[PDB]
Write a protein that binds this ligand. Structure first.
Ligand SMILES: Nc1ncnc2c1ncn2[C@@H]1O[C@H](COP(=O)(O)OP(=O)(O)O)[C@@H](O)[C@H]1O
Ligand SMILES: [Mg+2]
Lengths: 244, 567, 114, 111, 244
């Protein structure tokens, strides 16, 4: 089969089997299957794998990064492909409790994390004074040291990106309701969930529809599965600015 | 109580009413709508009655509901008797209640006498009250029934005519005196009136010699050309042909003119005009001809010889009208030879009589009926204006000549005649084009002058805007079924006298069979529900989907072609 | 260019064969007859439209003359599609289009019952 | 709920609807369009259908959103059967929601 | 005399006997007559019964549940004929004191009966913040244990369906004027008449028009006869929601 024929039959086996749609088949199930075949072929230990084993290996709530889909179309075309597939947008954005879980590691510059936060803040918030339903995104960072984590929050405060984190004063216990009023507060730009234990407590205090967007490189946190999930792996943190 | 409303502001023809409580909700549903009736008084014997023009029910956060009713006083009720007129004044505040059934009944049953009532509809908001009209003033002044397609215009036309036929005076059995002529373009009223005479193109023979001077020139001559020589020879050929076929008193023979309604043969007229196109003269300016009996010279004694085709010209120079009528003769025999005009220009018009034609039109012949239906569906459209103008003028002039007998005998006209014009804008358009000119003036003279001669109109049209304003204004009774075209709505608003708030935008929202009658026949303009036709005006039309669904027919095509060759 | 209207085939063709062509009642029956008049010269295009529209209407006119004589339910309803109808039936009263105007206006005014 | 709309003013042929709460934005985009159909009733048995004619959504600095819908009562349904009518009265206030699929279908299929 | 032809004849002879309307001659008078036919089918010693006994027994104020037209028309068709015949609505339903008496057994679960209450509350109340004459339904439940009746009231309060029962505190006597004030209260969704004894005490304290819509499966009460009554026997509680 020619190159213009076998790719558009490669998805039809998964698509008819799972009865899925267009976007979660070519970009979510095909791309994981391509990556799940190289790491089992480059390995010189085992090659035989059951088809039922291969079904559950690629049907995880994760968009695996694919190296071969990075130079074939380019940096710009791959992030454009990931933009309109899982982060589809509308003209009117609903006041939803959107949670953004970004993997902060020690090799990442603080500045590159910062422009990701302003990109999330300017995209997923309507803090206008004439809003009767204001909303602002929730930010969660994991995998970094607290000294590097607290440094990021301090620089965000100096340049007037006011946030709340559930700790209104020093020595406070984690009150999750400060994140709740900050969601509807026009003067609070975003919420800053500190750790994963703070994240699950905030989910029980939200009664409106909530969504989770995870962007990671190596390690990915486990959100409970009843929520809407977007878990996308990227080459580096600078890709997250161009997809959200 | 159930309703607590009172007048908060008055004006010369205008009341503002504030509903304060509205405890029982079904009062507002059917008794407080637009066009309903309100009793405005402080006692229970003397009151004014008011139509409802407009209302507005504002509701807000904390304040009370603002139900304001815009009403106009239609008259005055005193001890069960209703008196029309908005002159009487209510000083506010006056307690307002919905009018009882007896009050609404007395609105229409007081302005009209018991013998002058013509009931064919009931009130739309209150079924239990019937709405009579002054049947003398209903028909003597012309009626215009307008509305969109599918609104019930033809059912309303028939229901008026069935109630006109079925009504009778006491003490006699048989037919009644009513005479109605319907111009049927869609062949609907044949089923609605089964025991009536129906004349389509196949049986109705309209003599061409009954066409007057304007109609004969319209059918054959060209108005745009306006040729005085072609007009003069056409008149003198026809006038002479009427004389030579006259079998009567010579004193009547001398007064026969071009416009006088006597039999002439159109084939002989063509032959004479074709002959005078071949005119040749000698050196004495007299046209010399030779036929079977011998040589003769064209003069008044010998001009009848030119009706025969078998004559030859004998002259050295070309005649006076030579080479001037070749286009005229070709146009003249183009109309005759066409088989679609065989009912008006065929051999059947030779044997018909002037008296027999009049008996055919108003159904006074062997079979007599109140309703005469002229199925002019088969009439070609270029002579629809000719044929409507001929029948309308034959009826108006009969109505005029009926009165001139009756004034010599010092009597009133014995028979009145109603003519119904379905699709009335085709006969009488607003456009001043000459192709529908002759049908306009026939309907013009009935609209303007037929009131005094027993000839009236029933203008039933889908597009009233295309009707001429001059004919539409002469109508006084106006029935509007449903107008959805805004140009049609605005034209009728400019053509409807007074009546603000009732004609405004009720007409788009009118249901099927629901109509607005106004004029001098009805006491007040009201929305009525025209009663159902047990015998409806059904037109047999081709159902394309039912014919297209079935099998491709194969035996039919061979039969169509061979009879086309036969005919 | 006028061989379709004025050629040797126009002389040899019969009247019945013309109505089998315009209606598709010939050797190969068809529900839709497409008259591709793009190749027709523009100066004779109204002549060809008026000739066909007259022939189709007169077929429906003589359809009813059969139908009362035989008293039969079977009927042939015809719909005519006039693409670019403004030039076959213009508002202008010029003689270049009054032939096609008159044929269409006969169908518009009388063709409902035929 | 999804949408909390309500009739605030009634004319002979005109309806003014105030949308108090709009928790679902997707209803406004599709179901509250220029020519969309609204059902005006306090019960799911008998309803008055109106087509929208105009709307205005005005927001102010501290005041609540003022979403007004202007509609016209084309007809009435009883138990899923639509009757085209004129000047059938709905006494305000009346709960307004977009018309269901079977109600809009019955406008065109019943005739 | 076919199946449909005989059905038309018995309706006309019923309408001739009572000189009544046709909506309840077919749906109320015909259905009760057929039930007594099968009721005497078990013991069939009587074929000639005087019209002062058989016709008197079927001319009750109660509409009994017929199983044969429940099977012949169907579940949806039978409940649809009980809509158009008894529970007739308008666009402009008036503020009347509507009473809903529903029959409770222990076999019926709370969740189904809740779905009838929100069906009754949403259809028979206008608690609009702009209205001037708000109305709320009156609900009576009977034939049950007090533990099951108090259990239904507790979960109704937790999901923000505020009601009143004439007992504003513990140790209160049944003050009926909380029910009439709760009828015109915009913040009280419906009224909850506790038992039979509170129903008659409430009726003497209301002056506006009162309608009673009884829906039962086994037993029905002898409510007074001057107020309008609408009684339907149903197979189960799940049929009441598709009726009201
Ligand atoms: N008075 C009436 N009551 C109820 N229905 C009517 C009434 N008049 C007409 N209709 C219905 O309206 C339809 C339209 O008929 P009609 O008004 O005669 O058409 P048109 O207005 O195009 O001549 C008819 O099919 C008829 O069933
Ligand atoms: Mg008609």
């Amino acid at each position: 089969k020619s190159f213009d024929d076998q790719k558009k039959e490669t998805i039809q086996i998964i698509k008819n089997h799972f009865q899925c749609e267009d976007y979660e088949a070519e970009h979510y199930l095909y791309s994981n299957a391509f990556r799940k075949t190289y790491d089992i072929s480059c390995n010189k230990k085992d090659r035989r794998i059951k088809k039922s084993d291969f079904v559950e290996s690629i049907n995880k709530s994760k968009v695996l990064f694919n190296i071969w889909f990075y130079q074939y179309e380019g940096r710009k075309e791959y992030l454009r492909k990931l933009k309109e597939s899982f982060i589809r947008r509308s003209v009117n954005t609903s006041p939803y409790a959107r949670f953004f879980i970004l993997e902060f590691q020690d090799k990442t510059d603080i500045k590159t994390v910062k422009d990701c936060i302003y990109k999330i803040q300017s995209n997923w918030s309507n803090l206008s004074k004439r809003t009767d339903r204001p909303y602002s995104p929730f930010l969660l960072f994991h995998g970094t040291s607290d000294a590097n984590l607290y440094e990021l929050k301090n620089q965000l405060f100096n340049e007037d990106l006011i946030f709340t984190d559930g700790y209104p004063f020093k020595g406070s216990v984690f009150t999750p309701k400060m994140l709740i009023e900050g969601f509807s507060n026009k003067e609070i730009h975003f919420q800053f969930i500190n750790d994963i234990d703070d994240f699950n407590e905030t989910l029980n205090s939200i009664n409106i529809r909530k969504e989770v967007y995870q962007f990671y490189t190596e390690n990915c946190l486990d959100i409970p599965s009843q929520l809407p999930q977007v878990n996308i792996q990227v080459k580096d943190f600078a890709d997250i600015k161009e997809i959200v | 109580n159930d309703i607590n409303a009172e007048v908060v502001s008055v004006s010369p023809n205008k009341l503002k009413i504030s509903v304060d409580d509205l405890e029982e909700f079904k009062i507002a549903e059917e008794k407080l709508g637009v066009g309903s009736y309100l009793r405005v008084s402080d006692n229970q014997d003397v009151a004014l009655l008011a139509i409802i023009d407009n209302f507005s029910i504002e509701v807000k956060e904390s304040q009370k509901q603002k139900y304001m009713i815009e009403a106009s006083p239609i008259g005055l009720v005193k001890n069960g008797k209703f008196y029309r007129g908005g002159d009487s004044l209510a000083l506010p505040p006056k307690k307002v209640e919905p009018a009882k059934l007896d009050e609404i009944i007395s609105i229409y049953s007081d302005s009209i006498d018991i013998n002058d009532r013509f009931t064919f509809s009931s009130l739309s908001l209150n079924t239990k009250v019937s709405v009579p009209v002054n049947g003398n003033r209903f028909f003597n002044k012309h009626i215009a029934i307008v509305g969109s397609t599918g609104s019930g215009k033809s059912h309303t036309v028939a229901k008026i005519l069935q109630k006109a036929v079925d009504e009778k005076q006491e003490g006699y059995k048989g037919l009644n005196n009513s005479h109605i002529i319907i111009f049927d373009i869609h062949s609907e009223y044949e089923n609605a009136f089964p025991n009536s005479n129906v004349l389509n193109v196949d049986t109705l023979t309209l003599p061409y010699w009954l066409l007057n001077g304007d109609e004969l020139e319209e059918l054959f001559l060209d108005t745009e050309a306006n040729d005085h020589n072609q007009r003069n020879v056409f008149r003198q050929a026809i006038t002479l042909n009427k004389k030579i076929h006259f079998q009567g008193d010579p004193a009547t023979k001398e007064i026969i003119s071009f416009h006088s309604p006597y039999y002439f043969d159109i084939n002989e007229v063509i032959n004479y005009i074709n002959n005078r196109n071949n005119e040749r003269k000698n050196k004495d300016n007299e046209h010399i001809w030779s036929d079977e009996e011998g040589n003769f010279k064209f003069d008044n004694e010998n001009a009848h010889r030119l009706f025969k085709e078998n004559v030859t010209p004998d002259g050295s120079s070309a005649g006076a009208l030579n080479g001037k009528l070749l286009n005229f003769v070709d146009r003249l025999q183009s109309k005759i030879f066409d088989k679609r005009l065989d009912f008006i220009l065929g051999e059947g018009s030779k044997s018909v009589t002037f008296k027999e034609t009049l008996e055919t039109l108003i159904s006074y012949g062997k079979d007599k009926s109140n309703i005469t239906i002229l199925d002019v569906s088969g009439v070609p459209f270029e002579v629809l204006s000719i044929c409507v103008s001929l029948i309308s003028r034959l009826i108006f002039e009969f109505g005029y000549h009926s009165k001139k007998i009756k004034r010599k005998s010092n009597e009133n006209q014995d028979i009145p005649i109603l003519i119904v014009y379905e699709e009335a804008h085709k006969y009488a358009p607003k456009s001043d084009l000459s192709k529908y000119r002759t049908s306009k003036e026939a309907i013009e003279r009935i609209a303007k002058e037929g009131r005094k001669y027993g000839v009236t109109l029933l203008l039933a049209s889908q597009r009233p805007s295309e009707i001429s304003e001059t004919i539409f204004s002469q109508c006084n009774t106006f029935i509007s079924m449903r107008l959805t075209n805004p140009d049609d709505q605005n034209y009728v608003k400019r053509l409807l006298p007074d009546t603000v708030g009732d004609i405004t935008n009720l007409l788009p929202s009118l249901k099927e069979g629901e109509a607005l009658i106004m004029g001098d026949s009805i006491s007040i303009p009201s929305i009525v529900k025209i009663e159902k036709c047990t015998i409806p005006p059904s037109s047999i039309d081709i159902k394309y989907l039912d014919e297209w669904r079935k099998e491709w027919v194969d035996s039919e095509f061979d039969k169509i072609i061979e009879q086309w060759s036969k005919s």
